[PDB]
Every structure is written in structure tokens, then in C-alpha cells.
Design a binder for this molecule. Structure first.
Ligand SMILES: COc1cc(F)cc(N2[C@H](C)CN(S(=O)(=O)N3CCCN(CC4CCCCC4)CCCN(S(=O)(=O)c4ccc(N(C)C)cc4)C[C@H](C)C3)C[C@H]2C)c1
Lengths: 448, 31, 61
């Protein structure tokens, strides 16, 4: 933090607000950040030759809030990679007013990683052959992506220092899923075919079919059971899964804490069933995603090998290897032919969410020991129980809560995948569990 | 060092978008 | 080695669920309304922004 310190000051920074920002200006800044994110997501890059190749990173476009061929190609990568590299350096003991140096080096490294990513994204050939594009065009694309990542970091700091609600990672990820669901519901796009003109949006197609078709019953049947375009049984399943996740996320083990330092403040410490709120979903989706992009790049080179044929066998959906057993089955209908694949997938999704949750409670400092230390340091004690028994009463709840909120969230993802709900299961879980965070922020600011 | 506010961040975010549009328009009417 | 730990985990989870504060009708309605409002805001703002930029991207690109 001293050798690189010269380079850790030049980058811009956000001033902490002098006074507490009201819940009106915070929502205003959140809306401005969201609007900037969306507009940059819809603006194509300059220098692209042909965005006709299959997307190398199609699988991570959801978790990373990315949009191919646009300014927001990396999405929330500048935010995620900076934090990840900071934690990796801290854990490896390479790195230790020091907060300013840490928060400057974080942004300085999250832009070097952003540049490296903007170089890896171009040599993949998704924008065309770099030799044909030329050094000038490649450099211009890299500069555009660098400025976009800088804007991403600035907007995230704007949201986090107090000017807005929540964080960039949650807001952008939830936005790209809510927008996807709303687009698959109201798409003006019309995929023509031999049958005729039909809209790609389920509701718009329902209206078009009820208007232009004489056989109204066969129009309702079609608009409800289309197998080529989003139908209404996939939008009703989305609402049902939303309702189920909403019900199950409201579970909480209300602990009656009672302070002993300043006597008088009795309170409730809620231990939610979803203890790690969608962190198991982010971790599982990130694992599989970054593994499909690897088994997909290693299925072109080194083709026909053994390690490649076991890691994944692509067609682009997997048909064998490890990738096949991690991919959701094509609804419950495609389970009859392959039962072992469905069993392995349902087992993997639960046993990975549970493992990730029970590991994250120890890694993120939310384990029963850490909560007991917080209780001891704040004077909090459980009302009915004793003061030295707080650790036991927390160890009898928090580990089980984390494990079962991993199983529950994995099962909800599996159910959403099996119901054909729009937005996937990861997306519907990442949308609901992030809208609930903003709902909690809303109630907190409105009660304070 | 440099400590910008939310308003400069919004201005820079809008100017980058505008510059991208100007590049695209210049390319379209130059090609 | 497998039956006993799984049974203990199942019992612990069942007790935790039977001791959690499950939402009632009013809380479920409030959370559903808030989630619907947030989803509408984000999704429809993104939908309108995407609609605006389809002709624009068709012209410029
Ligand atoms: C077809 O081309 C190919 C082929 C191939 F054989 C491999 C690849 N590589 C490339 C490197 C490009 N990259 S990358 O730059 O896109 N990158 C992933 C990088 C991997 N490590 C480690 C990183 C780098 C090391 C130093 C800090 C971190 C995963 C890091 C985190 N991830 S995450 O798990 O997805 C994730 C996690 C959490 C969240 N939250 C919402 C909180 C979101 C996402 C994000 C990175 C920013 C993305 C792809 C990779 C496949 C690309």
C-alpha cells in the first residue's frame, strides 16, 4: 500500500455526504444510476465488425449483469473483480488512513482487471477477427470498456457511500432479470413463420391471437401452450414462483435480545431462514457459468480428448460430460428418458447451495461465534436465556438456518426450472431476494 | 486526491454516452 | 454414519421451521405488493429504455 500508493490517488473518488441524505434524493440517485446502467446497456460499442458469432460468455451475462455487444459488456465485473482480488490479496497476507489506501488500491486494481478483461473479451473473436479489426479499433474498444468500467465503479460508490439505496451488484443484476421477464411478456418482436405473424411477447401474442384468429379456443390454447415462444403458462409459473419465494423468504427466527449496557432497549434479532440471502445462488450460478465458458472454449481446442469429453460435451446445450449433469433438465417432461440425470441435478443443486451457505456463514463473518462476539461487544443478551449461553443458543440456530436456507433456495431454483418459469430459477431467485433487500432498506429508512 | 461528487459522475456518464453516439453517427455519415 | 446425521439435520430443520415466524396474510400481502412494485419499476423502465433504443441502434448501426 506504499509502493503502489503513487498510483492509488490519481483515480477519482466519491465524497461522503456531509448530511444524511433524505429518502427522496437517495431514490432519485438510485433511479439515475439505474437509468444510466440501462442506457449504457442498450448502446452498442464502436468498432464492432459482426456480432453474429455465438456468445462465448452467454452463460455469465446474467450473473454479471452484462449485455453483449454494448457498452455494458462487462456488467458488474469491475465491482466484483476488485473486491475479489482485494480479498485474495488480504487472505494471502500480501496486503494488510489505511482505509483510504485500501479503497484506492481496490479501484486501481479493479481497473487493471477491467482492462485485462476487455482484452480477453476481444481475442475471443466475438467482435470479429482482431487482425481484421486492427490495433486502432481494438484499442478504441478497450478504451470504451475501460471508461464504462470506471463509470460502473463510480455508480457503485455513488450507491454505497450514501447517495443511493443498496449496491450496484444487486441493483443491476435484479434489473437485467426484471427487464428480461417484462420483455418476454411484452415483446413487440414478431417471429414470423409458416403459420403467420405472432408476437414474441406472451400477452401481446394473446391479444393478437384473440383478435386475428376465428377459433378463439384454439387461440387461447396456443397462446397458453406455445413451445416456440414465451407462453402464458411460463408467465403464470413465474408469478407462482415469485409468490413461493416471497413466502419462504419471510421466515425468520425472532430472537428476543435485550441490552445490558444501556438498560431499556428491548429488541428482536431476526435470524432469517434465508440466512445467506441468495449468496448460495450467486456462488452456484457463478461456478457452473464459469465452467460452461471453460468447457466450451476447451471443446473447440483440444477437441476429442478425454479430459475435455468428461468436463463437458456440447452440441449450444450440453449433451454429456460434467456439464450435462449440472444443466437443468428440459422441464419435467424431459426427465422420463434420463432419470439419473434429474436425480444428480436435484441432488447437486441442493447439496451445493447448502455447502455454499454453511461455508459463507464462516467466511463472511456471520458464524455463531462471530454473532456471539457481536452480542458480547454490544452488551446484547437473549431475554429468556443467560449471558454465557448466547453462543450455544446461536449455534443451535444459525448453522441449521444456513443449511436449510441453502436447501430451500436450491429447491426453489429447481422448482422454477421445472415449471418453465420465465427468468429461470436463478434469475427469479436473484430478482426476488434482491427486491426484498431494497424493501428492507425502504422500511428501515421510512421508520428512521 | 481527486474527489468528485455525484453530479460530476452523472455528467461524465452522460458525456461518455453522448461521445459514443457522436462516434457512431460520424461513422455512419462518413462510411 | 449417514442415517444418523441426516436424521439429526432433518429434526433440526423441522424444529427451526416450526419455531420460525412465518408470514401471515397481511405481511405476505405487504411483501408481495412491495416486490410487485419493485419488479414493475425496474422491468418496465428497462423495457421502455430498450424500446427507445431499438430504432436508434437500427439507424446508427
Ligand atoms: C471463452 O473465453 C474464456 C475461456 C476460458 F477458458 C476462460 C475464460 N475466463 C477469462 C479469465 C475471462 N473471464 S471474466 O473476466 O469474465 N471473469 C471470471 C474470471 C475467473 N475467476 C477469478 C477472477 C480473476 C482472477 C482475479 C480475481 C477474480 C472468477 C471471479 C468472479 N467472477 S464470477 O464467478 O463469474 C462472479 C462472482 C460473483 C458475482 N456476484 C454477483 C457477486 C458475479 C460473478 C466474475 C468475473 C468478473 C468474470 C471468464 C473466465 C471464464 C474465458
Amino acid at each position: 500500500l506504499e509502493v503502489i500508493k503513487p498510483f492509488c490517488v490519481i483515480l477519482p473518488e466519491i465524497q461522503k455526504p456531509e448530511r444524511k441524505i433524505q429518502f427522496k434524493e437517495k431514490v432519485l440517485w438510485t433511479a439515475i444510476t439505474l437509468f444510466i446502467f440501462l442506457v449504457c446497456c442498450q448502446i452498442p460499442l464502436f468498432g464492432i465488425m459482426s456480432s453474429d458469432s455465438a456468445d462465448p460468455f452467454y452463460w455469465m451475462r446474467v450473473i454479471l449483469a452484462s449485455n453483449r455487444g454494448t457498452l455494458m459488456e462487462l456488467g458488474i465485473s469491475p465491482i466484483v473483480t476488485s473486491g475479489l482480488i482485494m480479498q485474495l490479496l488480504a487472505g494471502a497476507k500480501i496486503i494488510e488512513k489505511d482505509r483510504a489506501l485500501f479503497n484506492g488500491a481496490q479501484k486501481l486494481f479493479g481497473m487493471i482487471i477491467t482492462i485485462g478483461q476487455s482484452i480477453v473479451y476481444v481475442m475471443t473473436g466475438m467482435y470479429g477477427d482482431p487482425s481484421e479489426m486492427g490495433a486502432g479499433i481494438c484499442l478504441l474498444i478497450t478504451i470504451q470498456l475501460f471508461v464504462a468500467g470506471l463509470i460502473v465503479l463510480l455508480l457503485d460508490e455513488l450507491l454505497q457511500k450514501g447517495y443511493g439505496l443498496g449496491s450496484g451488484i444487486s441493483l443491476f443484476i435484479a434489473t437485467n432479470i426484471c427487464e428480461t421477464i417484462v420483455w418476454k411478456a411484452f415483446s413487440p418482436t414478431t417471429v414470423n413463420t409458416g403459420r403467420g405473424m405472432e408476437f414474441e411477447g406472451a400477452i401481446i401474442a394473446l391479444f393478437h391471437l384473440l383478435a386475428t384468429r376465428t377459433d378463439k379456443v384454439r387461440a387461447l390454447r396456443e397462446a397458453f401452450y406455445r413451445q416456440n415462444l414465451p407462453n402464458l403458462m411460463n408467465l403464470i409459473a413465474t408469478i407462482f414462483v415469485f409468490a413461493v419465494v416471497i413466502y419462504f423468504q419471510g421466515f425468520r427466527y425472532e430472537l428476543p435480545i435485550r441490552s445490558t449496557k444501556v438498560r431499556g432497549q428491548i429488541g428482536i434479532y431476526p435470524i432469517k431462514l434465508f440466512y445467506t440471502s441468495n449468496i448460495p445462488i450467486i456462488l452456484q450460478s457463478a461456478l457452473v457459468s464459469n465452467l460452461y465458458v471453460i468447457s466450451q472454449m476447451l471443446s473447440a481446442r483440444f477437441s476429442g480428448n478425454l479430459l475435455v469429453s468428461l468436463l463437458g460435451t456440447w452440441s449450444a446445450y450440453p449433451v454429456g460430460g460434467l456439464c450435462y449433469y449440472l444443466s437443468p433438465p428440459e422441464s419435467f417432461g424431459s426427465v422420463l428418458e434420463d432419470p439419473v440425470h434429474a436425480v444428480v441435478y436435484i441432488v447437486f443443486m441442493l447439496g451445493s447451495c447448502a455447502f455454499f451457505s454453511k461455508t459463507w456463514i464462516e467466511v463472511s463473518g456471520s458464524s455463531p461465534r462471530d454473532i456471539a462476539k457481536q452480542f458480547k461487544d454490544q452488551g446484547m443478551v437473549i431475554n429468556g436465556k443467560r449471558e454465557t449461553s448466547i453462543y450455544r443458543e446461536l449455534k443451535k440456530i444459525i448453522p441449521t438456518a444456513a443449511a436449510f436456507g441453502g436447501l430451500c433456495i436450491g429447491a426453489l431454483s429447481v422448482l422454477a426450472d421445472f415449471l418453465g418459469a420465465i427468468g429461470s430459477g436463478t434469475g427469479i431467485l436473484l430478482a426476488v431476494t434482491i427486491i426484498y433487500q431494497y424493501f428492507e432498506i425502504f422500511v428501515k429508512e421510512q421508520s428512521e | 486526491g481527486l474527489k468528485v461528487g455525484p453530479v460530476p459522475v452523472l455528467v461524465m456518464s452522460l458525456l461518455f454516452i453522448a461521445s459514443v453516439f457522436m462516434l457512431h453517427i460520424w461513422g455512419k455519415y462518413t462510411r | 454414519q449417514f442415517v444418523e446425521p441426516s436424521r439429526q439435520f432433518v429434526k433440526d430443520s423441522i424444529r427451526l421451521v416450526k419455531r420460525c415466524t412465518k408470514p401471515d396474510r397481511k405481511e405476505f400481502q405487504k411483501i408481495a405488493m412491495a416486490t410487485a412494485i419493485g419488479f414493475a419499476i425496474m422491468g418496465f423502465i428497462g423495457f421502455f429504455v430498450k424500446l427507445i433504443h431499438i430504432p436508434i441502434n437500427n439507424i446508427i448501426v
